[PDB]
């Protein structure tokens, strides 16, 4: 969504039902109730920037062009932070307190499904069987809550994507299904779409660079599992959802700028935007984790 001014946004929520029978000679206003309402909020973060500075003598003593390529690494360094900031919001819908685990009492909650102890599942062909087995129980939890069967996704690392390709090979399965052995592709698995992401447990941007090019981070992926924390870095195996559980609000969009400096004989290039992230529906989310040791 997009807005024009302000520091936040609001989403309304509503839903209920009714029905009784009326005897002849009664009034409708003696057995009446109402429907309930609530709301959600998402807040803007700030301004994010990146820049370079080039002098005019080193640009003349050189034998290849650099200006046109410096502007291609400025537009994709800003599109990776916004991609790691959203995957860290699907793991906080699953850490809500028990007394506040759903919007309106009776609409549904979030699911956390365990796979098994890590010590026992040692072979890489002993884990794909469990992962496939638990994708038919997570298919029956999104149907008891009336979620539409049109857009469902599953996210995992490239290391666990090769543990499902090892459980469908001639040394482990009885007949051929799904995979393609000559290219390494997986088709849909029970209506889901499988996606592999090399940067899954990386969070958002920070406030200071390091030596390699060190301060407060925003949208950090949770670190250690505890009593009130279900999903952490040392537990996650994957995340699944419907495309109505997470949203984004834009105030300003991406743009580039150029400037000329005369006191130091150089040029400057900048890029920037402003956004915000958050989660909306708790009843369209889930996760797969390792069983406690």
């Amino acid at each position: 969504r997009t807005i024009q001014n302000g520091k936040s946004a609001q989403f309304p929520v509503m839903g209920r039902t009714s029905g009784v029978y009326l005897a002849p000679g009664e009034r409708l206003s003696d057995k009446r109730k109402g429907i309930k309402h609530t709301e959600k909020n998402i807040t803007i973060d700030g301004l994010l920037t990146a820049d370079v500075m080039i002098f005019d003598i080193e640009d003349a003593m050189n034998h290849y062009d650099v200006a046109g390529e410096y502007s291609n690494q400025l537009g994709e360094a800003l599109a990776i932070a916004a991609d790691g900031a959203v995957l860290a919001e699907m793991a906080i819908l699953c850490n809500l307190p028990a007394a506040s685990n759903e919007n309106i009492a009776g609409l549904g909650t979030a699911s956390v499904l365990e796979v098994g102890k890590k010590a026992d599942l040692n072979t890489p062909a002993k884990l794909g069987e469990a992962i496939i087995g638990q994708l038919t129980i997570a298919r029956a939890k999104l149907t008891s809550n009336y979620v539409p069967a049109g857009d469902r996704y599953f996210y995992t690392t490239p290391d666990n994507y090769s543990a499902i390709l090892a459980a469908l090979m001639p040394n482990a399965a009885n007949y051929a299904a799904l995979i393609d052995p000559e290219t390494g592709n997986i088709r849909n698995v029970m209506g889901f779409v499988v996606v592999e992401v090399p940067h899954l447990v990386q969070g958002g941007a920070g406030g200071t660079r390091g030596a390699d090019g060190a301060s407060g981070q925003k949208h950090a992926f949770p670190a250690t599992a505890a009593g009130a924390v279900k999903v952490a870095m040392d537990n996650v195996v994957g995340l699944f959802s419907h495309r109505s559980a997470v949203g984004t609000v834009k105030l300003r969009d991406l743009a580039l700028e150029r400037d000329r400096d005369v006191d130091a004989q150089g040029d400057l290039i900048v890029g920037k935007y402003a956004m915000g992230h958050g989660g909306l529906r708790p009843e369209a989310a889930g996760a797969l984790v390792f069983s406690p040791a």
Partner: protein, 49 residues
């Protein structure tokens, strides 16, 4: 160091705390309403009417 400038969002009245830098801005309406998922019946055309 830093550049002197204006603080349009800080509240600097008399006897009022100014520890928040976003106090004088407003909250707005997004543009979408989250309604509940629909329900459907299954036995409508499978018996005698």
């Amino acid at each position: 160091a830093n550049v002197p400038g204006q603080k349009v969002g800080t509240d600097q009245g008399k006897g009022k705390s100014g520890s928040d830098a976003l106090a004088l801005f407003l909250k707005v309406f997004a543009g979408e309403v989250l309604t509940a998922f629909t329900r459907r019946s299954v036995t409508a055309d499978k018996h005698i009417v």
